[PDB]
Design a protein around this motif. Structure first.
Motif, short mmCIF file in Angstrom:
data_model
loop_
_atom_site.label_atom_id
_atom_site.label_comp_id
_atom_site.label_asym_id
_atom_site.label_seq_id
_atom_site.Cartn_x
_atom_site.Cartn_y
_atom_site.Cartn_z
N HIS A 1 41.94 28.53 32.86
CA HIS A 1 41.92 28.96 34.05
C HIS A 1 40.80 28.47 34.81
CE1 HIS A 1 42.89 31.92 30.83
NE2 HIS A 1 43.85 30.87 31.72
N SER A 2 39.58 27.96 34.46
CA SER A 2 38.51 27.29 35.41
C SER A 2 38.02 25.87 35.78
CB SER A 2 37.31 27.76 34.30
OG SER A 2 37.53 27.72 33.36
N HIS A 3 39.74 25.46 35.15
CA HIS A 3 39.60 23.68 35.32
C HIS A 3 40.28 23.71 36.67
CE1 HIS A 3 43.57 20.77 35.03
NE2 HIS A 3 42.62 20.14 35.76
N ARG A 4 41.69 22.95 37.04
CA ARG A 4 41.37 22.39 38.32
C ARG A 4 42.42 21.55 38.83
NH1 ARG A 4 36.44 19.10 39.48
NH2 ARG A 4 36.98 21.48 38.05
N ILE A 5 43.50 22.10 39.37
CA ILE A 5 44.55 20.94 39.49
C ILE A 5 44.64 19.63 40.42
CG2 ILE A 5 47.28 20.56 40.38
CD1 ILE A 5 47.48 23.43 39.23
N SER A 6 43.35 19.50 40.65
CA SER A 6 43.15 17.97 41.08
C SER A 6 43.10 17.29 39.95
CB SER A 6 41.52 18.56 41.43
OG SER A 6 41.12 19.73 41.78
N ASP A 7 42.96 17.21 38.51
CA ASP A 7 42.95 17.15 37.50
C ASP A 7 44.86 16.40 36.88
OD1 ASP A 7 40.83 15.74 36.07
OD2 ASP A 7 41.14 17.16 34.46
N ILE A 8 45.23 16.89 37.78
CA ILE A 8 46.56 16.68 37.34
C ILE A 8 47.61 15.47 38.12
CG2 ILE A 8 47.84 17.30 39.63
CD1 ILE A 8 49.17 19.84 37.98
N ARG A 9 46.38 15.34 39.30
CA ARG A 9 46.25 13.81 40.09
C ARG A 9 46.70 12.54 39.16
NH1 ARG A 9 46.98 10.78 44.87
NH2 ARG A 9 46.19 11.98 46.42
N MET B 1 58.72 8.99 36.48
CA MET B 1 59.30 9.17 38.37
C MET B 1 58.54 7.78 39.02
SD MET B 1 59.16 11.52 35.86
CE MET B 1 60.69 11.33 35.48
N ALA B 2 57.84 7.56 38.91
CA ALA B 2 57.03 6.01 39.77
C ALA B 2 56.95 7.33 40.82
CB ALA B 2 58.29 5.42 39.37
N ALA B 3 56.83 8.37 41.26
CA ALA B 3 56.14 8.61 42.67
C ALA B 3 57.89 9.07 42.90
CB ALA B 3 56.55 8.32 43.58
N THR B 4 58.54 10.74 42.07
CA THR B 4 59.55 11.39 42.15
C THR B 4 59.23 12.68 43.03
OG1 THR B 4 61.73 11.64 40.53
CG2 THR B 4 59.24 13.28 40.26
N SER B 5 60.45 13.29 43.55
CA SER B 5 60.44 14.67 44.28
C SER B 5 59.58 15.40 43.64
CB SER B 5 61.08 13.84 45.21
OG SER B 5 60.86 15.81 45.96
N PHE B 6 59.09 15.69 43.16
CA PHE B 6 58.72 17.01 42.16
C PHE B 6 57.40 18.09 42.69
CE2 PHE B 6 55.47 13.95 40.79
CZ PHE B 6 54.36 15.20 41.58
N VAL B 7 57.82 19.29 42.29
CA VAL B 7 57.57 20.62 42.49
C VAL B 7 57.32 21.88 41.88
CG1 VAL B 7 59.12 20.12 43.90
CG2 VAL B 7 58.43 22.74 44.52
N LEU B 8 55.83 22.50 41.98
CA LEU B 8 56.36 23.55 40.86
C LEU B 8 55.75 25.25 41.96
CD1 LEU B 8 52.98 23.60 39.16
CD2 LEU B 8 53.68 23.78 41.12
N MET B 9 56.52 25.91 41.30
CA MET B 9 56.04 26.85 41.50
C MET B 9 56.13 28.37 40.64
SD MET B 9 58.38 29.43 44.43
CE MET B 9 57.96 28.19 46.00
N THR B 10 55.41 29.34 41.65
CA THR B 10 54.90 30.66 40.13
C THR B 10 56.03 31.84 40.06
OG1 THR B 10 53.31 32.34 39.73
CG2 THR B 10 54.40 31.84 41.70
N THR B 11 57.05 32.17 39.78
CA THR B 11 57.74 33.68 39.73
C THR B 11 57.34 34.38 39.31
OG1 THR B 11 58.04 32.21 37.30
CG2 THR B 11 59.79 31.46 39.06
N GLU C 1 53.76 29.63 46.46
CA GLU C 1 54.20 28.65 46.25
C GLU C 1 52.36 27.90 45.35
OE1 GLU C 1 55.67 26.35 45.32
OE2 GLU C 1 54.54 24.64 45.30
N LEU C 2 52.35 27.02 44.31
CA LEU C 2 50.73 26.79 43.45
C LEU C 2 50.33 25.88 45.15
CD1 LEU C 2 50.96 26.69 40.75
CD2 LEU C 2 49.83 24.39 41.40
N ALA C 3 48.68 25.96 44.65
CA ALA C 3 48.11 25.10 46.01
C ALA C 3 47.04 24.37 45.99
CB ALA C 3 48.19 26.33 47.01
N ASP C 4 46.32 25.35 44.99
CA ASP C 4 44.31 25.16 44.07
C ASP C 4 43.83 24.14 45.03
OD1 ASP C 4 43.44 24.14 41.44
OD2 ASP C 4 44.03 22.41 42.51
N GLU C 5 42.47 24.31 44.65
CA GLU C 5 42.30 22.86 45.76
C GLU C 5 40.81 21.94 45.05
OE1 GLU C 5 42.62 26.32 47.27
OE2 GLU C 5 42.67 26.40 45.32
N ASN C 6 39.88 22.39 44.19
CA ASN C 6 39.71 20.86 43.82
C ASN C 6 38.28 21.71 42.72
OD1 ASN C 6 38.15 22.50 45.88
ND2 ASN C 6 36.29 21.16 45.98
#
Length: 89
Positions: A33-41, A51-61, A66-71
């Motif tokens: 909860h106090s992490h950051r998707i910036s780490d997902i990179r 994947m080597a750069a594949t089109s993927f995306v996630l979303m909250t049902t 649509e997710l977003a986050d910042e840093n």
């Protein structure tokens, strides 16, 4: 930097986004909860050789948003639903 194993202490609750490739793929992603998707990179670059750069995306049902986050943290995105759904195509 590069975690490759960013997980929350078993003594704390965590969010887990599970992505499923269409060609029979499976990847579990646990975020905090106090992490950051910036780490997902770094996570993708840590093990995204296929994947080597594949089109993927996630979303909250839950809030159908649509997710977003910042840093900053990770839950600050307001999408902290604990369970997110990623779709790899």
């Amino acid at each position: 930097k590069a975690s490759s194993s960013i997980l929350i202490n078993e003594a704390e609750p965590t969010t887990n986004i599970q992505i499923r490739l269409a060609d029979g793929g499976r990847l579990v992603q646990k975020f905090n909860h106090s992490h950051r998707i910036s780490d997902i990179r770094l996570f993708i670059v840590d093990a995204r050789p296929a994947m080597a750069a594949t089109s993927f995306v996630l979303m909250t049902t839950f809030p159908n948003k649509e997710l977003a986050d910042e840093n900053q943290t990770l839950k600050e995105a307001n999408l902290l639903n604990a369970v997110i759904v990623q779709r790899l195509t």
